[PDB]
Design a protein around this ligand. Structure first.
Ligand SMILES: [Mg+2]
Ligand SMILES: [Mg+2]
Ligand SMILES: [Mg+2]
Lengths: 364, 364, 363
């Protein structure tokens, strides 16, 4: 099952008592069945309360989404700064080469961020450039020679090397006094920022797309947001009670990357007398699962479930269901055609299709 | 000759007394000389009078063109239906993930369709998802487990399997009564739909680009059509009497994919003391020939010829001729430069270039 | 150092007493670290005064820049001609499949053209199609058969072969009389064509971006020019006095291709737990690639002049790590600076403020 990505598929970049930064292996590492995802990578960050991820930039375009907790994300530009107070469901597009740092200002909640990255110099391959100098990594400033550094900073190398080069890793503890000072002018999201070119936006800013007693699905697309339109990506989040089933359906043109935030679930995927291929998998918290465009899929929540999804090639994507009383494509095919396509009669076919009176999310 | 594609290069996907679905091999299969066409595939469909292509969707963007006959192409959306009555020269873009079926409503004419496909999940590799259940293929619904299907459809698996799972292939016969019932409300093209975002358009909707006693060429480009602009593709159709010659010319930036509909022709292609490379081939009905951008080419009709062409990387493409009285690039080169580029004198060069008083199509 | 391209990396296509056409090898030939430049190729042209580059077209989109001298670039369309008088710093985008010829109208100056090419049929691979017939190459017209050519031109093959098929190479001498007649209606650039859809534009048409006693940098981006916008490319030219240093900085998202026009320089680049230190000494005509986000510094060993093609340019930012202007480090709060660097907040500020100059400083 090349579409299932569990912990063995992630790679740790930085880890200590305060935080864990890791990246998913290249989507096309194992199988070449996901070739059109070669330009993308998934980054995962988790940190304890009152912590700071040191300043750095990446040679990759970034789309950040907060799964759990609160974060003060501060973009450090060459002539100014932009800080944002981001909470669960907030997303922010950070251009490649933008220096930034992240603070978890909460006193009790851990922070969990997921980042969709799009490398610039090589397809799906990139590096993180930390300005800081720790035991886990040397500052990129150390790449320059002594004579160069002396001329640039116009000071003796013994001083530069003492002040700059001379912490355990890239995630460090920060005082409540410093957190309070670093959170002063942080801007947050609002229903107005839904269509902003630079400000953060929440995935639950509007009414959910699907919503009943068993589940809810919220979504932000390239249609309302300029940031997402340029990346041609949609973002969605789903909540399902234990025992609920996300009815059979397929995405018309979007390649969907699933990230399990909370809970467990069984997922069935269908690929292609010509036989169909049955891909099966049991998903756990933090697992990743890829749904190729056009492939029918089903998600069954084993416990209270919450997952997020990044939709690549998103523009005008359509969700077509094969069961249920709403958005059921089969119920749109005329009886004359249904009768020729299936063995049963036009009557048996319609009676069957009407059996399930609920839609989207049903009892498993 | 890596640019010539005869019948041995097509792959049969489905075939019986009523129809034949075939797909051309990957363009860069044999030679890596067509590397920039690896994202595209050509699909061919031919069916007898009064038949139906069963409902399915593809994980690939589709641009459909009718070469012969009539078709009732019905797009089945999750909330509704859209059916079109298409005749020769009509084209329609069908987005990936769109379920549809095709009917040949005519009583005597065979339908012939050509589709330019653009796979979503893998470069130039895709699959067809048929909802139907026949001897040639199982429904993709059979990919889900019994328990899942029971909960989804709220019915015992014995009923589902009986009505939905339980025809010889994907092409079947259809009564005239049913054809009549499925042909109601079908919308057709007209001079106005040339610039429609979703309606079909005819390649001969307007005056031909080139036209004389020996030939005609019609063309629709991204400049007037939004569907074509989004794909950055142009469509053209050519008619040439037996013994006519399509004068030497090259496409400035478009990579042109030719498909012979009727007739036969000899084609010469020129690639690159540095010597030129001569590519020769004799074309027959249904053959395909690729003309890389910038490569001089000539088409000589051995018999009454009719062919269609899909032009990739089409925006602002230009046809530059090297002979004839119209659009001859050589006649635009100042005599001072002509004399320095060619061994002959300025007078000898001007006299030679002027001998051919006809343009575009001349006697072979 | 896979980022350095010296004379050994170029390929001669045509050469004689009057001119020299060469093309840089595929960027991803030696290494795979430059995979996202695989669709690009750099073409170089140098010619003597009073010379003509014979008419031809290429199956590649072109972005032409004049580094030295003057040129009459004439685009020959199927229905007419477009002529342009190009001088130093002038640029013009020429669509794939456009026939054209180049004249060096000057009586004393050598012409130097650099061309960024984007091949159409194959990533980074293409060919030049010359109409001319010389000892170095046959006309692409010879690719057709006698019977086709006879029907096409409506003339016996003996005449066609005599008049067209039958000069040593594709660069030839041309009289001053012919040059004056061939320059009759050439349009030139001006501050008014900086953002032109079809006309040539000059890199120094407006005030430089950075400018002090030691150096200068001019730049034209997709934001102002439509031709550059469609290619998502920016063009810049730099002038540095001997002993000057282009302060440490990095391009946020643009992959920059450097071309040395005059002078020499030492360049330091840093990649990525230890950092990788790429070093190189640059000479005239050398090429050097600077990946996006990679800190870099340029030290002029002698009076220096170089041009740069910036790929993936839209909204590119230049972030410096030293100096009194556009310094990213000076924008990092002291609470954070103090946590990322071992020195104290006071020691970090004093250090960052020591350099009162910006962009270009004393090496
Ligand atoms: Mg504390
Ligand atoms: Mg019948
Ligand atoms: Mg002379």
């Amino acid at each position: 099952n090349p579409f299932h990505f569990n912990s063995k598929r992630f790679q740790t970049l930085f880890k200590n008592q305060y935080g864990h930064v890791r990246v998913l292996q290249r989507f096309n590492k194992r199988s070449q069945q996901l070739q059109n995802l070669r330009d993308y990578r998934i980054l995962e960050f988790n940190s304890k309360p009152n912590t700071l991820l040191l300043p750095h930039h990446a040679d990759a375009d970034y789309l950040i989404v907060i799964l759990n907790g609160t974060a003060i994300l501060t973009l450090v530009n060459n002539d100014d700064r932009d800080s944002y107070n981001l909470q669960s469901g907030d997303a922010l597009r950070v251009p490649a080469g933008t220096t930034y740092y992240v603070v978890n200002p909460d006193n009790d909640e851990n922070l969990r961020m997921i980042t969709l990255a799009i490398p610039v110099n090589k397809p799906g391959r990139f590096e993180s450039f930390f300005l800081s100098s720790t035991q886990a990594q040397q500052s990129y400033l150390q790449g320059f020679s002594k004579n160069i550094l002396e001329a640039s900073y116009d000071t003796k190398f013994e001083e530069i090397n003492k002040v700059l080069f001379g912490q355990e890793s890239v995630i460090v503890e920060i005082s409540k006094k410093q957190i309070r000072e670093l959170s002063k002018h942080a801007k947050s999201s609002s229903r107005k920022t839904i269509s902003s070119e630079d400000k953060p936006f929440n995935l639950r800013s509007r009414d959910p797309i699907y919503s009943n007693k068993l589940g809810k699905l919220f979504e932000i697309t390239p249609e309302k947001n300029p940031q997402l339109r340029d990346l041609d990506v949609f973002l969605s989040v789903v909540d399902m009670n234990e025992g609920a089933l996300f009815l059979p359906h397929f995405n018309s043109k979007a390649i969907v990357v699933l990230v399990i935030n909370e809970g467990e679930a069984n997922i069935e995927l269908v690929g292609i007398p010509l036989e169909v291929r049955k891909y099966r998998a049991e998903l756990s918290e933090q697992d990743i699962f890829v749904i190729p465009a056009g492939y029918p899929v089903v998600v069954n929540a084993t416990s209270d479930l919450n997952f997020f999804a990044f939709g690549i090639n998103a523009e005008n994507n359509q969700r077509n269901f094969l069961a249920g009383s709403k958005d059921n494509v089969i119920s749109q095919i005329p009886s004359q055609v249904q009768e020729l396509a299936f063995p049963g009669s036009a009557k048996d076919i319609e009676n069957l299709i009407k059996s399930q009176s609920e839609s989207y999310f049903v009892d498993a």
